[PDB]
Amino acid sequence: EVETFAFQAEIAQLMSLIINTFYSNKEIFLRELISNSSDALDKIRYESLTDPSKLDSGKELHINLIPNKQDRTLTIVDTGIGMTKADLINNLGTIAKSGTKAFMEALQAGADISMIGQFGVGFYSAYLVAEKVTVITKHNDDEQYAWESSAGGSFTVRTDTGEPMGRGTKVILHLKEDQTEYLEERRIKEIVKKHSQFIGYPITLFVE
Amino acid sequence: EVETFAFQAEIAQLMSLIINTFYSNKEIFLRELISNSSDALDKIRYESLTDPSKLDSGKELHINLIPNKQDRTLTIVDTGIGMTKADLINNLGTIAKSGTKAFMEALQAGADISMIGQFGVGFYSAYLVAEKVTVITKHNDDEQYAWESSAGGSFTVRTDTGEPMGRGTKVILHLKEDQTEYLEERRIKEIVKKHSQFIGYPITLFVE
Ligand SMILES: CN(C)c1ncnc2nc[nH]c12
Numbered sequence: 482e483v484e485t486f487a488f489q490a491e492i493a494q495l496m497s498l499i500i501n502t503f504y505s506n507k508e509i510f511l512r513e514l515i516s517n518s519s520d521a522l523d524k525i526r527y528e529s530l531t532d533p534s535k536l537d538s539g540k541e542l543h544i545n546l547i548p549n550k551q552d553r554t555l556t557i558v559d560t561g562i563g564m565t566k567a568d569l570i571n572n573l574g575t576i577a578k579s580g581t582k583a584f585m586e587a588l589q590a591g592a593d594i595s596m597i598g599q600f601g602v603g604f605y606s607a608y609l610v611a612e613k614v615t616v617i618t619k620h621n622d623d624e625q626y627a628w629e630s631s632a633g634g635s636f637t638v639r640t641d642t643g644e645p646m647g648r649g650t651k652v653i654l655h656l657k658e659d660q661t662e663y664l665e666e667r668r669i670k671e672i673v674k675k676h677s678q679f680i681g682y683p684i685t686l687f688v689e
Numbered sequence: 690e691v692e693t694f695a696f697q698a699e700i701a702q703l704m705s706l707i708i709n710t711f712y713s714n715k716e717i718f719l720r721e722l723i724s725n726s727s728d729a730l731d732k733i734r735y736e737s738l739t740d741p742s743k744l745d746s747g748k749e750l751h752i753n754l755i756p757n758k759q760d761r762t763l764t765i766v767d768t769g770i771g772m773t774k775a776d777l778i779n780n781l782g783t784i785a786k787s788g789t790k791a792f793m794e795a796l797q798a799g800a801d802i803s804m805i806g807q808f809g810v811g812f813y814s815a816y817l818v819a820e821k822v823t824v825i826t827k828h829n830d831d832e833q834y835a836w837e838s839s840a841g842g843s844f845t846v847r848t849d850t851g852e853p854m855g856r857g858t859k860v861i862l863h864l865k866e867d868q869t870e871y872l873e874e875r876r877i878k879e880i881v882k883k884h885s886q887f888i889g890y891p892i893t894l895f896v897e
């Protein structure tokens with residue numbers, strides 16, 4: 482069933498910094514997420530070039546944005562490469578120990594938080610707006626897994642079976658109470674237009 | 690007693706755009722109001738090199754920011770050139786030397802509300818965050834006056850005797866009920882250091 486792991490101490494730290502530093506520009510989290518999703522989609526397109534079959538698990542390459550106001554969650558969904566259990570656990574297949582260190586080191590010298598994505602660590606900006614993040618992922622070489630954390634220094638990984646999702650990754654944001662603006666359709670289009678306007682993949686925003 | 694005026698049509702339209710356009714990046718109002726005070730100050734500093742009895746109503750050339758959570762107001766005070774009765778009506782109530790027209794056409798052709806200062810009408814960015822605005826002002830050549838407007842197409846002007854200020858202008862923003870972040874010390878410092886760090890007069894954030 483559920484394994485719990487500790488974050489490496491540096492990811493714990495950075496996670497803490499994002500949760501606790503006063504920084505009004507919280508919206509940059511979306512860009513960061515949209516920008517992990519594109520990269521993920523680049524990787525599967527890349528691999529399929531030489532191996533057509535990698536798209537048996539789905540030929541469609543795209544990003545959906547799914548707000549749900551009852552659940553108070555904003556789900557960012559791609560049909561990219563996905564993550565094996567190992568990737569999930571490996572920070573997130575991100576180079577996070579070094580990326581974090583450099584990053585905090587750049588934050589000494591006049592970097593502000595929005596540059597997070599420059600360090601391979603954009604993903605953790607989800608915590609600018611989210612109290613808990615669930616990540617569902619399917620990679621072609623592996624089962625479907627749910628990773629999850631409310632920060633606090635730990636994560637869980639369990640296998641996930643309720644709806645097979647084909648191939649790719651769902652990052653579910655359970656929003657903090659004072660951050661429900663990011664479920665508003667005009668708030669979300671405004672963001673995508675302002676930070677993600679030209680991106681190599683179709684972005685669909687679901688309606689309620 | 691109290692005189693009531695109509696905004697010149699275009700200004701009425703523009704104030705309507707500021708109030709009604711969906712636009713999340715409201716924090717720039719502070720930048721525009723500060724930069725307005727600084728032009729005021731430049732002016733009195735300039736005028737006073739050829740006539741120094743003009744500083745007779747106050748030598749300090751500074752900007753104050755006074756939040757007040759009871760009244761729900763943020764007030765920007767400068768000890769600048771002030772306005773006469775006439776300057777209030779023309780400068781606040783009519784196109785005057787502003788690029789109102791070019792600003793409104795610009796937003797038609799892709800520009801955005803943050804670029805408002807580029808057109809000399811950035812004072813109306815007050816209406817991003819305020820439901821009502823009162824300007825108390827005092828020029829070396831005139832009485833002290835209160836101008837006021839909750840938009841809806843008109844403004845008032847009366848003499849203001851409760852409270853002589855020497856020389857300059859206070860802009861008091863009665864903040865919308867959901868715009869009270871701009872009363873927070875931490876929020877105010879963030880904004881000034883982001884948009885106003887190079888202003889060339891002391892900017893004092895008063896404490897509550
Ligand atoms: C951040 N990260 C490690 C990711 N890896 C693979 N697919 C993803 N889709 C969103 N984020 C993804």
Ligand SMILES: CN(C)c1ncnc2nc[nH]c12
Pocket residue numbers: 725726729767769770771772780781812858860
């Ligand atoms: C808006 N406007 C025309 C202004 N005129 C003179 N002094 C000012 N201080 C802040 N705004 C001012």
